[PDB]
């Protein structure tokens, strides 16, 4: 889903994966690693600040 | 199949038939002795 975040100058730097799109791909998945847990990536996904 | 299913193939036909029936969903073969079990099972629970 689309988002978008306001107040960037408190920037989470949970974001940098997200950011530099280090994804892994693995059996057709797109897995980002937020913090300590793994997430499909969804291609549609986009973010706003 | 309910419950999922216990194959036993000693000529080794239906493991193979299994591997190509679902080839196209990435159907990965490992086994309980392999220490590569207990990630691969995480990983088929979380995405298919």
């Given at each position: ?49 | ?29 490992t086994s309980?002795?392999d220490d590569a079990f207990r990630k691969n099972l ?7």
């Open positions: 889903n689309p988002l978008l975040v306001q107040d960037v100058e408190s920037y989470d730097p949970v974001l940098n994966p997200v950011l530099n799109r280090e994804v892994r791909r693995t059996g057709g998945r797109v897995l980002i690693t937020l913090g300590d847990q793994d997430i499909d990536l969804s291609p549609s996904f986009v973010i706003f600040l | 199949f309910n419950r999922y299913p216990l194959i036993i193939d000693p000529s080794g036909q239906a493991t193979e038939f299994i591997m190509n029936e679902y080839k196209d969903r990435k159907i990965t073969r309980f002795l995480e990983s088929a629970l979380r995405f298919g």
